[model samples]
Target: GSGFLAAALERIEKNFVITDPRLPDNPIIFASDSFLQLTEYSREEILGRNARFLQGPETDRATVRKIRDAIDNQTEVTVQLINYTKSGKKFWNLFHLQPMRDQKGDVQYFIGVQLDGTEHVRDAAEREAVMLIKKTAAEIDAAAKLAALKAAIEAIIKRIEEAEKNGDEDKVKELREKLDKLRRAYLILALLIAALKGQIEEVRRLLEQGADANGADGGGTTPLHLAATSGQLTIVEILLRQGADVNAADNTGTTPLHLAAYSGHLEIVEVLLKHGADVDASDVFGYTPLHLAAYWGHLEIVEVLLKNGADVNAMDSDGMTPLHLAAKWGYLEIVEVLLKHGADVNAQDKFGKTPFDLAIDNGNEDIAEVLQKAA
Candidate 1:
């Protein structure tokens, strides 16, 4: 588990860097020798710095803000910008920046791979860079899980050991709860694995023998999370039959309703709706499921999520409604769907930009025109 990222990068021949997003300043934890060679920066100088340190003076401010926005949103996208070498030469950097998550699907690192050649060359490099990052993440899975599993067990036993010295019943008793969770951890793990893999038989065995139907791992990923995500109707029904929580959410607080919609699983969403009967309706952020369903361009799900008791004019934390997202992304069908549900035509965001303004600014002609008809 130790030095795993370094070891994985050793065999790669690309110009990419990996940064730990959870760290201070999102510092570059690892850099390719070729990236250092291309930029003429020494290993020591390049390490542990934010990406903007290498940006050239004339680099587009728009590109700068877009990357800044992605990190805030923890989003993945490709962008091109100007970079400066230590020797004062400038080059175009077509960079693919994305998060690489652990097996449980939490962000572990940000991999930014750059290509400095022609458009066609950069196009192909993006694919390989993303591929290598995924492969590298694949390489580190088992040992790291074993490490955390072992470490959690170790810490509690020591605390119980100290409890005996103090002649304190509470300390030892408190420590035992953690010990018990660590022991029972495998049931949740196995059941989630079963649900995720669509192994209905495996899940039945686990549910028959052990594990709460609503079992959640450390990251709060439940059995329903996967079954609903991939449209496993029979497996999801099995989970619900045994009292699996329909409203149960991942650690991100993302529920089956939003996820089913996000992944385009209509039938699973119907099952969840019948079971959930006021889902929290909101996800990890302050976003309503309609907000997710709307922004993601899932017209049918947006149509479903707005079938009410839901707020058709729901605004996110930023005061932007489903219409704002639909218009900006040019989801004309979604815009029409929301408006048909009597959604407001002229709602504005925290920044004072209305849906119509965003649609026009985003060059979304069809959405803009439809928004005009709404007026």
Candidate 2:
């Protein structure tokens, strides 16, 4: 404890001896070489006064709050407050307060580590203010766009409701298409608002600013994998635009595209495809994009991918093609689309079971019927 106390004093502005007036008042104020030079007052002159004598009118409120909070919480805190020197010149005092408790749970002497943190604190506050200003400006821009987008979407929704009541199918279809676009726009705007506000940009812009987008947090999942799995289309778009590797497999060999397809984000699938994401990408167990889409009943994405020339017959590590996965999961529409596009339905996986056999075992009669009719 003595060594720790000595080390603690080294961090403060004053090297002083501590003694209570109520007890054996052994004079404890001793100045370090730096402190002596700073104050020009010998250790003897300042022995009884304690360090609080240095505090003056220029002391900051926030610094005092930090010190007060720390003391209240029974934690150690360092503060830099303005203090007057022996010569009456104002200087910053860096005070590090530590609570020393006795074994009986009684409060003992408090150790202070004082130093001059004024210049550093001032500089830090200035920089923080500038950053906040920039962030606020970005938020203002995003807010303006969000307001406009909301009005546009509201008008579209109102028009669509009116058309539905009038039984105008053509107008309703047009309005529905417009609503889809508006929904996408709203999602993007919301994402931007969040990203520009606080730490939301951690998953979006931090990676592009030289932070690793593929780096996993405590949850063992990368930002790219998270975006894919959450079906966040805007986040996925932003990540991909920021150069997140589409084919960068996680520890489980699960690529972001696989998760996106699995979660049924058709728009995300389209965006990934436009960015050159590999359609035949496979995971650790050899499950490909098609396998995930098929397993999760993402028929729209599956069709879009197949139209974009995804390998329908591509096998996983287990040698199961897109057709095999679709059949096993009873995805009749996916199976039909794959077969129509020339997927070999009779092809067998490593288990010696064809797509039809797997469907029959899984009791997916819809897929069995489709396959049987195709056969």
Candidate 3:
């Protein structure tokens, strides 16, 4: 029953104290030991002095005005002010002032509660400083890269001019090809960044500026490939409408459909297939979209690929079929789907290991039994 009052008393004793505004200069009638510890001032030193002695040169005048207005109106106010300690060290003070009334409803003393917030303020400023530093460093790095790229292009131009002056038609043609290729690389990099950020208008602007939709990046990944991989349906549609190659292969022979299937973007897969993307196109390792979809356990993607004429029993370079992959990885649902789609249960890889054998070797008795029943 008395717990609430006891808690309030304890809180004041630890973090707060009362002041009599009726005294000269509204002196501190009482100061908590906690307050003394916070300011590093002796009780005798602070007992008769006004609390304004704690204000410092850095304190905001607007905050002081708010406190003054609140006190004149006998209303409560809270403000964070910069104050100085007994040793003249600056700290942030979360000062709260409220009027205390007597039994007659007359305002008597003002209750002042102060919280030390120096660490919080300092930490916030430090975080802002770090962010500013990182931003400035990134700007500098970008400027340096741009300058290097400009120098390389200028040198290539000079070589082309020299070749033309020497009447070397073959060298001139080769240099022209190099310049066009470099320009295409820059355009592709810009398109990739725009697509990745889903800046649809920027993508359209680049395309309108005669940027090749089929241009590939350093890794041979096209703009369409990036759009599909990022699940940007609108960008995918735009690229397709611009006659981007639906079946373009990257450095590793990975098509946009392969990336979409692996990422489980069913809509992108469907769009690519609608645009004449070969459903069973194999990468360098001979892994088709079906193999990737099954290996990653995307059941709906597997179904879509199968319905779109993906070879159910397509073998990769290792001669491993989708069933072999599904069973080996213990994906029972994918295993069942592949079996229903006419995947050969008795199929063997180059090492002559069957799907059932893989299931057994991997200790997946459930899949092995399913394959056993199929056999």
Candidate 4:
């Protein structure tokens, strides 16, 4: 009764063409009115014809190879290219798969969108492109373009100061903004180069100043804690600035905050404070930041964790609280500070050894007196 679907497909000016890859030679089965009008091939002429009939002197055989390669591998691809229309007018093509399939994924069709892109420049990052003709000018030619860009940037920079002196803030701002992008496109190399030969993991991270936000590779030994474990005050800040999780933990349940608190990374601990770090997040062994810092005897870190609200009474794998672990380690060396915190001096361990018992067994009478007096 109605050819509405076909009629609407013919009606819209969005420019689509469908080719049956299964058909011998992959001929164009249907082209929308927009493309039909644009191709100017007398409708029927473009209908059954293939791309082989359309290309000319300016056609890039490399781009042709990419399209054939993607189709042969049945992999979807995005490419942008220049092609000559019937009257020698050049335009662009974008590809999208057909809306509904012929049942199985094995059944395939190539759908393309066309535009009059006789003049344009774009990035794979900025804006968009026709999804099948990624006709790059090739990297061998890219160096000259960058030199021209460098020359242009110097030209603009030398001119920007003159504009600033003329009180033209708008001119200076735009030129400065443009210069940033020109520089951005000009950066990258050492990170990839070094990676080809090394995993000087710390060196690479510092040089790159970026890492996958949540990438742990395989062990949840993610980027944040590595800096936290080392004394990388800046790397911790950089990772957090790049949106790496501040509270990210390895599979062992140790967070960046915990590592920062334990390894004497006071500056990083303060940075994490603003990012909602888990001050009380227990490790797989139930060792809170306070326990690690208190036992390691970084009094400053202990004070930070304690003042910022830590679980002072939190017990570890053997049910030993911060006080018991510190007492068992030597004695009131840390207990003087811990005792005044939210600790229970009488707290017990898994074997039922109290804080004072650990202090009595481990330290001299001078150490034993503090716990005995407190007990």
> What is the C-alpha lDDT profile of model 4 across 44-158, one tens digit per residue?
7776667565566676778777778876776655555567777877665443332222313353456555555645445332123432222111111122233445666788889
Q: What C-alpha RMSD separates each model from the true structure?
A: 7.5, 27.7, 25.5, 23.9
Candidate 2 lDDT, 1-375, residue by residue in tens: 133234334443333333332334323333454566666677667655555556678777777789768756766565557877788788766566555444244535544444554454643353343333333323333343465567778899899889989989899998889888767656544543443333445545544445544454222345666566555677777767777777777657777788778767687778877888888777778777887877666768877877776778787878888888777766677788778878886787898778889988999977788788888
The per-model lDDT (C-alpha) reads 0.74, 0.63, 0.77, 0.62
TM-score of each: 0.61, 0.44, 0.54, 0.45
**Model 1 over residues 25-110: C-alpha lDDT tens digits?**
99988887878888888878877888787787878889888888888888776777787788888887776777766656777887
TM-score of 3: 0.54
Poorly placed runs, candidate 3 (over 4 Å): 1-183
Candidate 4 at residue 290, lDDT? 80
Shift in Å, residue 33, candidate 4: 76
Candidate 3 local lDDT, 12-88, one digit each (tens): 33445556677777777667678889899987898767888888789898999998998889987766778888999
Model 2 poorest 10 in a row by lDDT: 132-141
- Point to the candidate with the largest TM-score: 1
What lDDT does model 2 reach?
A: 0.63
Ranking, lDDT, top scorer first? 3, 1, 2, 4
